[PDB]
Design a protein around this nucleic acid. Sequence first.
DNA 1: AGGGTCCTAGGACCCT
DNA 2: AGGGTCCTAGGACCCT
Lengths: 367, 367
Amino acid sequence: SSRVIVHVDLDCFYAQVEMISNPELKDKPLGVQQKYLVVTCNYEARKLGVKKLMNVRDAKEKCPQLVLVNGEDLTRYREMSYKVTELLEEFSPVVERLGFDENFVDLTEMVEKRLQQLQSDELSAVTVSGHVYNNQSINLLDVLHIRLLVGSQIAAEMREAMYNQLGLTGCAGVASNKLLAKLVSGVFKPNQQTVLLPESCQHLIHSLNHIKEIPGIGYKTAKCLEALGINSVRDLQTFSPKILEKELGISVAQRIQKLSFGEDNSPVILSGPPQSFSEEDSFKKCSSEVEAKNKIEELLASLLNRVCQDGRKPHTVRLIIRRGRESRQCPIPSHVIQDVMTPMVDILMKLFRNMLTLLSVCFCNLK
Amino acid sequence: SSRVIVHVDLDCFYAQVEMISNPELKDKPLGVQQKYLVVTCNYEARKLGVKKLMNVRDAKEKCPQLVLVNGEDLTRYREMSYKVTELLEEFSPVVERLGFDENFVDLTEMVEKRLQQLQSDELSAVTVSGHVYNNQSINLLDVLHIRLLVGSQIAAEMREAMYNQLGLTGCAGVASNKLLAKLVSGVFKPNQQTVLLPESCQHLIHSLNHIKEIPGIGYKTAKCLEALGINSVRDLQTFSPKILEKELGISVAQRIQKLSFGEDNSPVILSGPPQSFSEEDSFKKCSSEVEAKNKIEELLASLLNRVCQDGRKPHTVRLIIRRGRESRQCPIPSHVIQDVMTPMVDILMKLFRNMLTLLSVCFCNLK
DNA sequence: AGGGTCCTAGGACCCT
DNA sequence: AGGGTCCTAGGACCCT
């Protein structure tokens, strides 16, 4: 029942893609901006103090030299994202996408195969690729250390192939479940990998400074927990399972408390093709008229290109607006499944009439 | 793009099953009761005035001779229901279940096969099995009349097999879509079949006396339509598509108005195994204590037997209560997927604590 | 921002 | 009653 999981986490993905386009952008600090927010920056910029999602002003304050670059159109990032997932699917088919720049792979079946092909004398010659978390000592007769080290060898092969075949650097973390692989992938953060041996699991989770930092524990469950006096990982570990049950639920409770201990039995899901296709347009209260139809015609403009090129067809469209958000959705008529936009704009226009700073159209329920 | 669909509608299903158990119950009027309500009755009882869902009192008023029989445990009905669906799946695999006693089958691929095997001279020798709606005249050079007549021959073979192999009588309606097949299956109502030729589609839908009677038009959309002055099928046919769009939605609108015309492009779905397993317990305010745990232990008692024997395992449980209803659900822990009830009662007990005349537990999200 | 994921609790519909 | 179906609109989570 042992598992070997790798978390692959590309460095400043958007920046990497832009720096590939215009090679001149390298060397100097680089921000990728979405409206008034630098969402991503290359290492240089990050050394100068440009932080994740920093105002284009505060960016130009710690870093007047910034060479900013617009990244509101995610097409090129989305395409490279899937080129990376597909490269990893070639290693082992079971790859889970988390956002655009992170992937989980279950290396278990693959690690086991590489061992039965390996020979007796090799077992002692097994080496780690990259760092070992907390410099922990390897025990070459621990079957679990050997598998995690083979896992680190596969992880380094993936990272080498991502660079060689797509020009992308990134980090990797090798552990026995998704939680720990993701928590250890970032220990050595620029284009490196780390492997976690079980004896250091507690050191790793306790290296966190607030249950905020546990993936699966967002703002809501965080502030909720902070209202029970739970703040450190150890607090959540020792807190009453009972009060937690009745406070957050039976679902949230035991999952969160197990994450507290480094436990995470959740399987690596095959992400396969997307379950949805959305696009967003925000503006300085630019919508209060039939302009919404010029936008929406534009949002949907590029989508129909996307949702078509995919192959499958959506059987539901949705329209989203900001003024918390609201949505009104409807099934896509059969006739409209196969010129469109005359019929589709109309669909979403009446969805729009039923219901302005944001505006989005999402194609979902694909078949 | 022509379709041949059969709607199979067993007569007083519950009664049929009971009359099979204790053959003595035949001959005399028979009611199947659920609390203070005769939900089903054999033809005899129905001749005496016992109507669908009639008080056990009003039942014993038009029909003091009633020989009532309890039918709150649906196990035996549910089992025969699936024996009937499986018999029809043998004819053609694509069978859609609607409730326990109704099934749709798409006979198109099957009718077409029977024709290419049939010979030239036979085409004129094709006959209808059962009634033709509105006594309409057959045109043996109308390819659509011939296919619907082959459809009627398959329908009669199914009904003969349901009787011969399961002892069940029932009705059948043969049409070109689901709506019309279901509307015509009941024209000759006791253990007979009817076929609808297209030239009589309008006669059939206009034979209805209120859009209430169109399947897919329930109480809500009905009263809504009745507020627009729409009452007859012709009203809905001629009513403004536009006002209907803005009143009921773009989804409801065109689907409802097409049903008005006898149009229904919806495909026959393969129902396959159930998507859920529920059981219900209602009582005269009998629950206001740890009794709910004695019930719930009992509701869930039989379910775990059911949801297990199926094979797949649910990955969500739900608890439902009446005091409109309310539900609180949660994922079923991995450990509990495989003794249970010690863990499961507890799960639903805390779901119960979070939230008494009704009480139910439902196992859903099966895999 | 711009973009995803899956769940949940209520609601409509079908049948008896 | 006792039992099903699928949808929807909001909400939580992940990433930038």
